């Protein structure tokens, strides 16, 4: 944990989430795994945090969730907003094609004298299932103690495990959550049900205070109750200047 | 306490969730070694840190082997933020020093344990001296042959010490034993 | 107890109840058991708390109760207010069927410019009885007691 | 927490204070603080307060037991010499008889 979360990305993500929490009571940051060969942590993978800049509208949780940390959630939609060259890189890094332009819901709004916008929105869909899959009970050839391995993880290594001192003892069925990720573009599915290594939805939310008033969640920060007085002060100062 | 305590608690909850997610990802991806002790008669408390990895023998890619029984056996908690496992140990040693009163063997042990944890090469004299003292007091166990050399040197030097009062008392006892022997000799002198 | 109530759910439930009690003087949280095999506590069951987000209207106690903790009560109605996909999940969890839509009393009100509502309410009914059941007295072979 | 409270209620320079310090030290978790934990466990075994569990624990206990008998007070030896000299003088008187 110290090795993975030492770089600047984790601290920047946490600081962004904290500032968002302070201003408007919501924030988030995701965990993404990646392949690295020059300086691996334990295996040829590295775990890194990633920042989400506007968790108010880019991250959309399940409406049936009831906890603050969204432990009991089965859906999560992240609406990426990215530029043309960013879209080309995104298509390159997966197996997508950069010739068709994806589209989705527009989180941001055109309410400022801004010049241009990216106008390229793509979405990612996370879901969690429980199926009670099977598992194999082996015997450790080094020490005479039983070990259990899931069938799916070692389904291509069963013969190799049999080649070594490992011997099968019995078969069981152990329930375990799994996480799948798919990419949607409001007209078709680009990649369908990719198996994420995790067991929970990577996005970790922070909330302003908390609240469910009648049946809909409400969160607050610091600026909600200081708007009317501030606007009145601005108006009085403007009138006095006039 | 502070005015932002509720926000701090919410951040702590989010950090606990992040720790849970990270633990799950590590269990599913990385190679966690399993700690087993041989409990040999010659070697006591040997942390072998056994690992298990198998190759497919049909492709260059490896395959992870994590036991299910020993996956979830450490819970997540919220604490201060450091950057390496050495800084955590340094902070704990400093806390124990703060809680330990002066003029106590525990204080000296904590000072030596802190001194043997520095990093810079400029401070190497003190690190080597602290390691030597800790090994010679028998608290630590030698690893590299110079360390067993230090230990055996300390063992040889220990037996050299002698208490003067013990020697003087032994001399007095020998004088008394000689007086008793003289009395027993006087008995035989009477016997003729 | 330390093992069961260590996770975030218990703390979140207690915090929600405390905040509710401060604002509107009532709050609650329930205890639910479950089946788990990857990390069971003692047997293949785990006990966890659960939060109730409006104890004013969703939890309805017996009218004949007289204590603060409702120890001497035989009635407890929990009016769930939950979504369509949540309703499908709920029907899948038990042996219900997802083809008919349940209905019940509406605890909430339409007193805000809100766009949509779940409009799917179901209830749970707890009751307590005392009937002086029987018991068997055995002899342990390990210890003669 | 209970050991910390008992430490707070116990005055310093007392055997109970040392026992509580050793009990607090033998409860740490991290591997970084392991030398102190092992030293505290060895001390608690050698003082006879605890009981040995693993074979090295009985080894420590028997080593402490052997080391205990080696200690000799110089005053004891000197006083024994005084008695031996006095008894020899009495034997000399009986020999004079």
Q: How many helices (H) and strands (E) does chain C have?
A: 2, 5
What's the rounded Cα separation, in Å, for the pair A63 and A69? 13
| Cβ proximity of B82 and A10 under 8 Å | no
What's the rounded Cα separation, in Å, for the pair D39 and D47? 12
- A vs B, Cβ pairs < 8 A, gives 105
Residue-by-residue DSSP string for A95-133: S--SSSPP-----S---S--------EEEEEEEEEE---
CA D59 to chain centre: 15
Q: Helix B5-29 vs helix A8-23: angle between axes, to the nearest 10 degrees?
A: 140
What's the rounded Cα separation, in Å, for the pair B84 and B38? 30
What's the rounded Cα separation, in Å, for the pair A22 and B11? 11
| Cβ proximity of B92 and D32 under 8 Å | yes
What's the rounded Cα separation, in Å, for the pair A20 and B135? 53
Task: Read off the tokens for B5.
Answer: 């305590």
| Cβ proximity of A192 and A182 under 8 Å | yes
Whether B17 sits inside 8 A of C11 (CB atoms) is no
Long-range CB pairs of C77-81 (<8 Å, 24+ gap) are C77/C123, C77/C124, C77/C125, C77/C126, C78/C30, C78/C52, C78/C123, C78/C124, C79/C104, C79/C105, C79/C107, C79/C121, C79/C122, C79/C123, C80/C121, C80/C122, C80/C123, C80/C124, C81/A215, C81/C107, C81/C108, C81/C118, C81/C120, C81/C121
Q: Helix D35-46 vs helix D15-25: angle between axes, to the nearest 10 degrees?
A: 140
- Helix, coil or strand: residue B93: helix
- Most D-contacting residue of B41, B88, B173, B187 (CB-CB within 10 A), to test interface: B173
Backbone angles phi, psi at A192, to 5 degrees: -115, 115
Among chain B residues, the shortest Cα distance to A157 is held by B56
Which residue from C8, C38, C39 is facing B16, i.e. has the nearest CB?
C8
| Cβ proximity of C82 and C122 under 8 Å | yes
- The residue count of chain B comes to 192
Residue-by-residue DSSP string for chain A: -TTGGGSHHHHHHHHHHHHHHHHSSEEEEEEEEE--SSS-SSSS-EEEEEE-S-TTTSEEE-TT--SSS--S--EEEEEEE--HHHHHHHHHHSS--SSSPP-----S---S--------EEEEEEEEEE---EEEEEE-SSSS-EEEEETTTTTTSHHHHHHTT-EEEEEEE---EEEEEEEE-SS-EEEEEEEES-SS-S-EEEESS--BSSSSB----SSGGGSHHHHHHHHHHHHHH-
| Cβ proximity of C44 and A181 under 8 Å | no
Burial class (CB in 10 A: 0-12, 13-18, 19+), A207: buried
Chains C and D are touching, with contact defined as 3 or more CB–CB pairs separated by less than 8 Å = no
Burial A82-110 (b: 16+ CB within 10 A, else e): eeeeebeebbeeeebeeeeebebeeeeee
What's the rounded Cα separation, in Å, for the pair C55 and C25? 10
**A176 neighbourhood in chain C, CB within 8 Å:** 38
Q: What angle do CA B16, C80, C106 make, to 5 degrees?
A: 135
DSSP letter (8 states) at residue B47: B
What's the rounded Cα separation, in Å, for the pair B189 and D92? 12
Backbone angles phi, psi at C77, to 5 degrees: -115, 125
Whether B16 sits inside 8 A of C6 (CB atoms) is no
Q: Provide the 10 A C-beta neighbour count for residue B76.
A: 17
| Cβ proximity of B50 and B37 under 8 Å | no
What's the rounded Cα separation, in Å, for the pair A18 and A38? 32
Whether A175 sits inside 8 A of C38 (CB atoms) is yes
Resolution in angstrom units: 3.2
Residues 6+ apart with CB under 8 A from D37: D25, D26, D28
Backbone angles phi, psi at B130, to 5 degrees: -65, -40
Whether C36 sits inside 8 A of A175 (CB atoms) is yes
> Which residues between 3 and 32 in chain C have a beta carbon less than 8 angstroms from any beta carbon of chain B?
6, 8, 11-12
- Determination approach: cryo-EM
- Those chains having 3 or more beta-carbon pairs within 8 angstroms of chain A are B, C
Whether C8 sits inside 8 A of B13 (CB atoms) is yes
What's the rounded Cα separation, in Å, for the pair D24 and D43? 13
Enumerate the H helices of chain C as residue ranges: 8-23, 84-93
């Amino acid at each position: 944990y110290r090795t993975d979360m030492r770089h600047n990305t984790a601290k920047i993500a946490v600081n962004i989430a904290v500032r968002e929490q302070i201003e408007a009571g919501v924030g988030a940051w995701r965990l993404v795994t990646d392949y690295e060969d020059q300086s691996p942590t334990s295996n040829n993978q590295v775990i890194r945090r990633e920042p989400i800049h506007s968790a108010c509208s880019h991250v959309i949780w399940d409406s049936n969730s009831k906890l603050m940390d969204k432990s009991d959630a089965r859906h999560c939609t992240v609406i990426h907003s990215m530029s043309q060259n960013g879209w080309e890189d995104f298509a390159e890094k997966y197996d997508l094609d950069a010739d068709d332009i994806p589209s989705f819901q527009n989180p941001n709004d055109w309410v400022f004298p801004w010049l241009t916008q990216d106008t390229i929105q793509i979405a990612e869909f996370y879901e969690v299932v429980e199926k009670k899959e099977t598992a194999f009970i082996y015997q450790d050839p080094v020490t005479g103690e039983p070990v259990s391995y899931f069938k799916r993880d070692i389904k291509d290594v069963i013969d190799d495990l049999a080649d070594s001192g490992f011997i099968k003892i019995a078969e069981r069925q152990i329930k375990r959550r799994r996480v799948y990720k798919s990419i949607i573009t409001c007209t078709a599915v680009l990649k369908d049900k990719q198996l994420i290594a995790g067991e929970h939805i990577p996005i970790v939310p922070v909330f302003g205070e908390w609240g469910f008033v009648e049946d809909k969640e409400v969160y607050e920060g610091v600026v909600r109750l200081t708007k009317d007085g501030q606007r009145l002060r601005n108006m009085i100062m403007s009138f006095n200047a006039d | 306490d502070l005015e932002t305590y509720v926000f701090q608690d919410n951040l702590a909850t989010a950090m606990r969730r992040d720790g849970e997610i990270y633990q799950s990802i590590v269990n599913d991806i990385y190679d966690v070694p399993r700690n087993v002790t041989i409990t040999l008669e010659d070697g006591s408390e040997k942390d072998v840190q056994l690992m298990a990895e198998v190759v497919d023998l049909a492709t260059g890619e490896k395959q992870v082997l994590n036991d299910i029984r020993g996956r979830y056996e450490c819970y997540t908690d919220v604490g201060p933020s450091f950057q390496s496992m050495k800084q955590q140990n340094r902070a704990e040693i400093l806390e124990l020093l703060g809680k330990t009163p002066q003029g106590t063997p525990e204080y000296q042990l904590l000072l030596l344990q802190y001194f043997t944890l520095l990093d810079g090469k400029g401070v190497e004299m003190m690190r080597d001296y602290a390691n030597k003292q800790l090994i010679q007091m028998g608290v630590k166990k030698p690893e590299t042959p110079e360390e067993q050399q230090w230990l055996v040197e300390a063992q040889q030097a220990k037996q050299g010490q002698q208490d003067p009062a013990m020697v003087q008392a032994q001399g007095v006892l020998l004088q008394g034993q000689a007086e008793l022997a003289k009395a027993q000799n006087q008995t035989l002198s009477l016997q003729i």
